[PDB]
Each structure stands twice: as structure tokens, then as C-alpha cells.
Amino acid sequence: DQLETLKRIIEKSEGISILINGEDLSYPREVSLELPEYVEKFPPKASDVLEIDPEGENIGIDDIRTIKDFLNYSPELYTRKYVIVHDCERMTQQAANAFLKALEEPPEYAVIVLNTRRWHYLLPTIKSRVFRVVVNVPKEFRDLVKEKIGDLWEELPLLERDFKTALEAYKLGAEKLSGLMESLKVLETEKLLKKVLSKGLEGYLACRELLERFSKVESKEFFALFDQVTNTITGKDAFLLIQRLTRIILHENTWESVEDQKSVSFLDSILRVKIANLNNKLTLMNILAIHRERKR
Ligand code: NA
């Protein structure tokens, strides 16, 4: 339904800039990625679709130059050439400025697919030149995954807000999902730490498993586990683990008490702190202790 509406808009366009907008963590990105093949009914060769998604928190003017060079040539197999820019609010002022001509008047054969979850974060100059499209993960999809994985859906709260991870769970099915959870349960701590920073499902399950170890390790051995984790995961990796664990601790616990309100306020605050202003080990210790004691 969504993809079909876009397809029609695209087929009667002589160049178009679209912004796929949604509250889900990955649905805007996945809709963007599947769009070209949905319109063309053929899979994408690299000469016909370009994906822009830098590893950091900024999309610079250099990324915009890349896009502009790519758009100057015709597609090989496809009718149209596609550019996908994930989480486009990351564009710098120079990047946005440099992208106005191509965005307002893209080549007749071009489709620029930007995506974000924050429409108002974009400069009015981007908003003025892009056809906005709000996307929502349909109810039927949730009912479809719940029915495939059963009780595991309520046991994994992230799935309701991360479409792609919910889709990986749906592809594995009940037995393999339960089997993956058990494989991580028996895995050695050194090996488990190599997965806590992975993308998607396996990273989420590894994070859940590491938290459970901090929650259940015998009192005498808690700091031994903590030292082993903090000696392996440091700097930016530690900041990333803090962020991920804070999200899991927040979303996978209930907070009714007055004492809980102090803990929630602390957990909520961590999410908004920049890497330069946080003590990693002290923060990790506190979130894990919060979680461990909440579970007790
Ligand atoms: Na999709």
C-alpha cells in the first residue's frame, strides 16, 4: 500500500526528492532500501542505486559531492537512478546548502530518497525541496511476527520499535530464536563481548544476555565480571555499550516507586550526555547496579 503509492508518484515525476519519515527506528531506512526494487521490479546494481550512511553523526559536503557525481550519469539497467541518504538530519549546513540545486531540480531520471525520524530537524531549505511521506509499520506486520515467534514477542520489547530486528526474528522463527538465545546463554564472556556491539538482533540478544549476567552473577563475583567487561570495551565502544544498555534497562523494567523515579531520571539523562562529558566506568557501574538491584 505505502510502496505502491510512492511508485505511482515516482512514475509520474521527472526527477523527485522524497523524504521518508517515521517514528520506528528502522522502518524509514528499510522502506527507502526496498523502494528502488519495488518501483523497478528488478534488483539494484551499484551503478543504479547509491546509499549514503557514514559511520559517525555527520553527513558532510564531501558526501554531497559523491552524490552529485553519481547523479550526473544515467542508470544502466533501471529506468531511474536512486540515491538513499539515511538519517538525513545529520547533514551539515555546507552539505544542505550544496544539495539544494540537485534536490530542487534533480535529473529527470533521478529519485533522491532521504529518510529521517525528525521532520523539523531539517533546514527549511531541505523541507521546501522534498516531498514528505510519513511511514508507519502496519498492525498486520506486528500480528504476523507475534504469531510466528509466540511468547518471545512480549519477551523482546525492542521488536515493536525496530522493524528490521523484528523482521530478523520473524525469519528465524520460534525455535531458532529460542535456540539463538540459548547459544548466547552458554557462550563464554570473552566471546559474548564480541557481539554486544553488533547491529540488529544478535547485538540486542547479546546485550540482553550480558545484562542478565550482571543481574545474576553471585555477589562476590560482580566486580570481577565488571572488570573483565571494562578492560575489553573502552572509549567510544564503552560509550556505545552504555547507550545500548541504558535503553534496554529503561525499556525492559517497570518504574513505579519514588526511588525508581530517581533511577529513571538518571537513565533518561545518560541518553542526552555527550561522550566528552561522561565517566564511562562510573556510569556503567551505576546503570548495571540499578538493573541488578531492580531485578532483586
Ligand atoms: Na519494507
Residue 166: CA count within 13 A, CB half-sphere: 25
User: Are both 1-136 and 137-196 of the same fold?
Assistant: no
Cα–Cα dist 66/50, whole Å? 9
Domain residue ranges of the chain, discontinuous segments joined by +: 1-136, 137-196, 197-296
CATH hierarchy code of domain 197-296: 1.20.272.10
Helix ranges restricted to H, the chain: 2-11, 27-40, 61-71, 93-98, 100-104, 124-127, 139-149, 152-155, 163-186, 189-192, 200-216, 222-232, 235-251, 258-271, 280-295
- For residue 18, give the H/E element and its range: strand 16-21
Cα–Cα dist 44/78, whole Å? 8
Reading phi first (left if > 0) and then psi (alpha if -120 to 50, else beta), residue 2 is in alpha
Separation of 34 CA from ligand 1 center, angstroms?
6
Separation of 31 CA from ligand 1 center, angstroms?
4
Cα–Cα dist 277/280, whole Å? 9
Cβ atoms of 152 and 182 closer than 8 Å: no
Separation of 164 CA from ligand 1 center, angstroms?
9
Within 8 A by CB and 6+ apart from 15, the residues are: 105, 106, 107, 108, 109, 110, 111
Within 8 A by CB and 6+ apart from 214, the residues are: 222, 225, 226, 288, 291, 292
Separation of 115 CA from ligand 1 center, angstroms?
13
Separation of 26 CA from ligand 1 center, angstroms?
9
Q: Which residues pair with 140 in a beta bridge?
A: none
Residue 77 grid cell: 539497467
**Measured between alpha carbons, how far apart are the two ends of the chain, in Å?**
47
Cα–Cα dist 223/84, whole Å? 45
Helix axes 222-232, 280-295, angle to 10 degrees: 140
Residue 18 grid cell: 522524497
User: Which residues hold their Cβ within 5 A of ligand 1, which is an ion?
Assistant: 30, 34
Q: Which residues pair with 191 in a beta bridge?
A: none
Separation of 158 CA from ligand 1 center, angstroms?
18
Declared resolution, Å: 2.0
Separation of 227 CA from ligand 1 center, angstroms?
41
Cβ atoms of 225 and 192 closer than 8 Å: no
Structural method: X-ray
Work out whether the CA dihedral 111, 114, 115, 119 comes out positive or negative: negative
Residue 161 CA, chain-centre distance (Å), reads 10
Classify domain 137-196 at the CATH topology level: Helicase, Ruva Protein; domain 3 (1.10.8)
Task: Tell which CATH architecture fits domain 1-136.
Answer: 3-Layer(aba) Sandwich (3.40)
Cα–Cα dist 18/133, whole Å? 7
